[PDB]
């Protein structure tokens, strides 16, 4: 069995390598990555996203969001709370003000201790899943707006035409903003280009003890859990890696800078901050074998979680006994 302590995985791939993505996926999980739940990919020295970021400061964050958090240093949730929109040179501007800016730190291990000391005391506004791209249209590999759609993957598999589509989203982030504790919506696969700006540190645990963290959280947010059985879908709970260390929870981290890919593997529990002003671009995927990962991924019902249009095709196809719970609680 390869890669048996599910160690996060690094790999450069040729520029030959980076022709076929789907190839390419499945190489990486031959070699075990998949058992990590997360791997880093560093692109050939030929390649590059697009020319320049020179050109980028007029794109909209319609509903930039605060992170309010509530709780204690290591086990938190975070609220979003609704600002005024403005460009992206506001939001870098904002970024670098004394109120937002990176503090003085030694190394990324002196700045993740300082994450996590401080980050409740502060509420950074952070600007998500706006749907676009930065990829150049002639960028021909690795491009996250060109990539085989899920739906064309689960017709392929499973001979059923759906109605959905599938873009990219960007972000655009700042010191402290934060990405709780999840899994893909369906459990899905995602990959995230970071292009332009300072590091994001990511945790994560292996799909095959996922359920060690549901437990996990269920004891730390006990509200929460009552409310939904399935409230990490919410996206809301913060759980610090010294917390997750004195509980027993097997978990990596690894930080991303800017030129990497990132991909996270079905039911691959992940959270993360960002060390500063900062893009990355996402955007979910599927293979073969993430059906049987789908077709057993929890649902939120309760109201919370709240998704995209396409996700409804993929309970309706995949899980249709729970199908009419979850569809009213997307109503
Ligand atoms: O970068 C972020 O804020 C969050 N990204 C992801 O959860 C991802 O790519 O799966
Ligand atoms: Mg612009
Ligand atoms: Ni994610
Ligand atoms: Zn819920």
């Not at 913060?238 to 978990?251: A, D, Q």
């Not at 998704?307 to 719970?325: C, K, N, W």
Request: net charge neutral; proline share 5%.
């Amino acid at each position: 069995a390869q890669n048996p302590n599910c160690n996060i995985m690094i790999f450069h791939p040729t520029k030959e390598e980076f022709n076929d993505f789907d190839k390419y996926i499945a190489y990486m999980e031959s070699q075990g990555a998949h058992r990590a739940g997360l791997a880093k990919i560093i692109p050939p020295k030929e390649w590059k996203a697009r020319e320049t970021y020179d050109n980028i400061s007029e794109i909209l964050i319609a509903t930039p969001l605060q992170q309010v958090a509530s709780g204690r240093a290591g086990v938190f949730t975070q609220y979003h709370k609704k600002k005024k929109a403005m460009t992206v040179g506001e939001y870098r501007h904002l970024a670098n003000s004394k109120k937002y800016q990176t503090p003085p730190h030694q190394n990324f291990e002196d700045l993740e201790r300082k994450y996590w000391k401080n980050r409740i005391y502060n509420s950074p506004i952070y600007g998500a899943d706006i749907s676009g791209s930065l990829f150049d249209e002639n960028t021909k590999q690795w491009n996250l707006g060109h990539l085989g759609t899920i739906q064309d993957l689960l017709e392929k598999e499973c001979g059923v035409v759906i109605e959905g589509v599938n873009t990219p989203y960007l972000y655009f982030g700042m010191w402290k903003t934060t990405f709780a504790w999840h899994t893909e919506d369906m459990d899905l696969y995602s990959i995230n280009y970071l292009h332009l700006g300072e590091p994001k540190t990511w945790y994560v645990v292996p799909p095959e003890h996922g359920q060690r963290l549901e437990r996990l959280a269920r004891e730390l947010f006990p509200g929460s859990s009552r409310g939904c059985g399935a409230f990490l879908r919410h996206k809301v709970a913060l759980i610090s890696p010294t917390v997750l260390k004195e509980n027993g929870i097997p978990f990596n981290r690894i930080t991303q800078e800017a030129g990497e890919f990132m991909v996270t593997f079905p039911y691959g529990y992940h959270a993360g901050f960002n060390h500063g002003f900062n893009c990355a671009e996402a955007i979910n995927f599927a293979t073969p074998r993430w059906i049987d990962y789908g077709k057993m991924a929890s649902q939120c019902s309760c109201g919370e979680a709240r998704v995209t249009f396409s996700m409804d095709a993929f309970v309706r196809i995949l899980q249709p006994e729970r199908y009419d719970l979850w569809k009213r609680g997307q109503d």
